[PDB]
Chain A
Amino acid sequence: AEYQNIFSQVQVRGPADLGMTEDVNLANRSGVGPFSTLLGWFGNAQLGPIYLGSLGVLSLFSGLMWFFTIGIWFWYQAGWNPAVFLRDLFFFSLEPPAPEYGLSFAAPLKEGGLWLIASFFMFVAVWSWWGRTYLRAQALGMGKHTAWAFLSAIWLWMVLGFIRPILMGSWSEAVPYGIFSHLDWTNNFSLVHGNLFYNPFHGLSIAFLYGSALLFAMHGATILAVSRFGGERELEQIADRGTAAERAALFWRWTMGFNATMEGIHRWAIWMAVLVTLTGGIGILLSGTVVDNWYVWGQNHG
């Protein structure tokens, strides 16, 4: 059988690659981590270096504090019993304040206060991480596409935990921290708003989520199919189109009557993906603030 380039047959290794300098403060990069031969069958073997820096420390600290606030609450719910902790791990939940507290921070620790504290740490962790996606691109002289794409994910997260609850006038509207409880919240949210299948922004979000899997399967397969002509060296194919890019384009042209370019497919990609959470966040933000029941809204079309 022909080799299909899903796993590599032979790995090679040279000196640890310390990366491009550009305007990066090298004093903030770690040393390299271990090389993983296991990872190396599918992707790069090299781990690290990673960029630290003070904003990075803030994100990591704040993110760890979020995780540990939830975890300590879980231990408390477990009665500090390790066996119970593991047994009931997916059932524990850190829940927002009751509706009576509105948007106040006056809720007692065990009744919403600790959720507010965990949420504050999460807010700092995510936004300081966003700053990092921007600044690491800036230091390398790169465009800011990653930061812009990340902002679309942040939009849905912000709508769910912050913007919508504020507009609704209570933290009780926000998502609990727990494995099963967040799934329960999601089901309940749909039931209470008259079935999200009737929310056209939910339908669109689904089209883009399915469409992201369609497009990445198409693009991943295409690049592998032309990897025998160096297709995955996409930047140099953009700069100097080769037979890889031409055969990729013509496969699609002959199949469905139109095609992309090596650069342009990545614009289809970024937009297909970001539209998942852009449309999703709109759909959720409108729910309960403007539309109480999507079935009813859809009967009026408006």
Chain B
Amino acid sequence: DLASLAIYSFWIFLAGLIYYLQTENMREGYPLENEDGTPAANQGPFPLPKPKTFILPHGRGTLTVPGPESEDRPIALARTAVSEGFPHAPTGDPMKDGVGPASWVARRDLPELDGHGHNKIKPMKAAAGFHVSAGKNPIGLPVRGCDLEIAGKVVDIWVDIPEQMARFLEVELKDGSTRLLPMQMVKVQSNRVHVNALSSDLFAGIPTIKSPTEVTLLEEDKICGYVAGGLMYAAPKRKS
């Protein structure tokens, strides 16, 4: 009967759809590798899909995936066991070396652009006439780390222009230089901004940006990685 035919057909369709979805989801990170970076013997039952190409706006070229995968950065970890499946120990300072939860990806060293080809994220002082429109304005507040010491003072908010949102706080340190802190990693209070992720002595080590009025995707990844890494790696200097 027609209903039996429909349901039988549907299950065949569904199996095909899952195969499509799973292979689409193999456009990044595959082929799977051994811990030494060579191709793994067992790739599983799904093959890689035929490549697709994204045309990027503003002359930025294209992305074709799947494509050759490479980290494009040194990774300062080493094996802790003689067989596969165990953790890899940082060989240096994992916050400085950008591994574990301090990891960053070698994204393009250019800023994300809006639909008009301008820098998506700008310090609020350079964004006409962006302003704080609700909530406690954090500009001017002292910035406290998880050791409960003051690490600096907020001197601006970096804003996403097309999306009208706060993305970073720019914090001036004791030496007069500044660093960016992800808005998602700070708590704005009445009298301070508190940063649980970092003790005050780690603020200097936040990766710096090369130009003082823009931030590239690479730099954002280094900064966001470093700050989040502090939850694990500054745990000793934190602090009931």
In the complex they form, whether A and B have CB atoms below 8 Å apart is answered with: yes
Residues of A within 8 A of B (CB): 1-3, 5, 8-15, 17, 20, 35, 37, 40-41, 44-46, 200-201, 204, 227-230, 233, 236, 238-247, 249, 258-265, 267-268, 271, 279, 282, 286, 290-291, 297, 301-302
Q: Once the chains bind, are A10 and B159 in contact (CB under 8 Å)?
A: no
A230-B220, A240-B217 known; A11-B228 Cβ under 8 A: no
In the complex the two chains form, is B134's CB within 8 Å of A37's CB?
A: yes
Report yes or no: B166 in contact with A12, Cβ–Cβ below 8 A: yes
Say whether, besides A12-B164, A236-B217, A259 and B7 are in contact (CB < 8 Å): no
Interface size, B (range): 35 or more
Known: A10-B138, A228-B185, A243-B224. A35 touches B21 (CB 8 A): no
Do B132 and A302 have beta carbons less than 8 Å apart?
no
A-B contacts counted at CB < 8 A amount to 166
A132 to B161, CA, bound (A): 28
A229: which of B4, B161, B187, B228 is its contact (CB, 8 Å)? Answer: B228
On chain A, the residues within 8 Å of B163 by CB distance are 44
- Report yes or no: A12 in contact with B132, Cβ–Cβ below 8 A: yes
A-B contact pairs, 13 of them (CB 8 A): A2-B187, A3-B184, A12-B166, A14-B131, A230-B167, A236-B112, A236-B217, A239-B63, A243-B104, A243-B105, A244-B224, A246-B29, A291-B1
Considering the complex, give the chain A residue whose CB is closest to the CB of B223. A229
Q: Quick one: closest A residue to B2, CB to CB?
A: A290
Q: Residue on B with the closest CB to A10? A: B135
Q: Which chain A positions have C-beta within 8 A of B167?
A: 230
In whole angstroms, what is the CA distance A268 to B131 when docked?
A: 38
Chain A residues in 8 Å Cβ range of B224: 228-230, 243-244
Q: Complex: how many Å from CA A59 to CA B138? A: 46
Is there contact, CB below 8 Å, between B135 and A228?
Answer: no
Q: Which residues of B contact A262 (CB under 8 A)?
A: 28
Q: Is B59 an interface residue (CB 8 A)?
A: no
**CB pair B185 A45 closer than 8 Å:** no
Interface residue? B19 (CB, 8 A):
no
Q: Which residue of B lies closest to A229 (CB)?
A: B224
**Residue contact B2 to A263, C-beta cutoff 8 Å:** no
CA distance in complex: A110, B103 (Å): 70
Q: Which residues of B contact A241 (CB under 8 A)?
A: 28, 105, 107
Interface residues of B in 137-171 (CB under 8 A from A): 137-138, 157, 159, 161-167
Return the contact of B27 from the options A233, A264, A290 (Cβ within 8 A). A264
A236 to B216, CA, bound (A): 12
Q: How far is the CB of A37 from chain B (nearest CB, A)?
A: 5
B136 within 8 A of A: yes
